[PDB]
Amino acid sequence: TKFIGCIDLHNGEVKQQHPSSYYAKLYKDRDVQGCHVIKLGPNNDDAAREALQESPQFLQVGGGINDTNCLEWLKWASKVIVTSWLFTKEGHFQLKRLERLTELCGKDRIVVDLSCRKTQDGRWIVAMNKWQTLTDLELNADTFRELRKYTNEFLIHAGGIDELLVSKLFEWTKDYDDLKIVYAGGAKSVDDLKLVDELSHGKVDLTFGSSLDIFGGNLVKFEDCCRWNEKQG
Ligand SMILES: [Cl-]
């Protein structure tokens, strides 16, 4: 279990003041591997490239990723993160679209980002279009078994963390040794690192974003998250 950093971009600006390259440099300097730059809506491409080019092939990029632009983004991103393109506007999962991305990029350069909503006890359904659309894809062991054929990494995007979900991510992927699972679910305590480590037997990584001091949050220290990583080896 490691701390994963992020940079969210909206209207060409970081969601927080510092430009995107500041954060890209910081993550590189502190050797925070596997961070994600996420474009929320349009007009973010320059700010995304600013971050990626500050630390070339070190940060991932998501938001508006499809078969037409994935190779160009991979010039500067370590991996591309697919989101809504895997679904029709009606919310139907399109496995053939994932297969196309893998065919173009390689399984080591794509991330499948699934935003999920807990509908009922022990049930999580993938959602799209700013959460407002439930898709026909459920999170469960079967979904992980099938989709891991096409990617080496999932970003699972969901007060405290959804502890039961983290436990389930472990349970559903226990037999996979080569699969990276990044959880992003609003963590706002440094204590969540050890908690996620315990729940997942070390197999799930944890994003911190807006709660961090470096983004103007007053809840979690970025340096504490880096120190956690440094202790893991
Ligand atoms: Cl990466």
Looking at residue 198, which CATH number applies to its domain? 3.20.20.70
Q: How far is the CA of 80 from the centre of ligand 1 (A)?
A: 9
Q: How far is the CA of 152 from the centre of ligand 1 (A)?
A: 11
Q: How far is the CA of 79 from the centre of ligand 1 (A)?
A: 6
CB contact at 8 A, 139 and 182? no
Give the contacts of 182 (CB within 8 A, at least 6 positions apart): 4, 34, 36, 111, 153, 154, 155, 156, 204, 205, 206, 207
Q: How far is the CA of 9 from the centre of ligand 1 (A)?
A: 18
Q: How far is the CA of 57 from the centre of ligand 1 (A)?
A: 8
CA atoms within 13 A on the CB side of 43: 5
Q: How far is the CA of 73 from the centre of ligand 1 (A)?
A: 13
Q: How far is the CA of 153 from the centre of ligand 1 (A)?
A: 9
Q: How far is the CA of 59 from the centre of ligand 1 (A)?
A: 6
**Which residues does the chain break after (C to N > 2.5 Å)?**
16, 158
| Tokens found for residue 177 | 């040794």
- Give resolution, Å, one decimal: 1.3
Q: How far is the CA of 58 from the centre of ligand 1 (A)?
A: 6
Report how this structure was experimentally obtained.
X-ray
Domain that holds residue 74: 1-233
Q: How far is the CA of 216 from the centre of ligand 1 (A)?
A: 25
Total number of domains in the chain: 1
Q: How far is the CA of 119 from the centre of ligand 1 (A)?
A: 31
Beta-ladder partners of 134: 127
Instruction: Give the whole-angstrom CA distance, residue 200 versus residue 184.
Output: 14
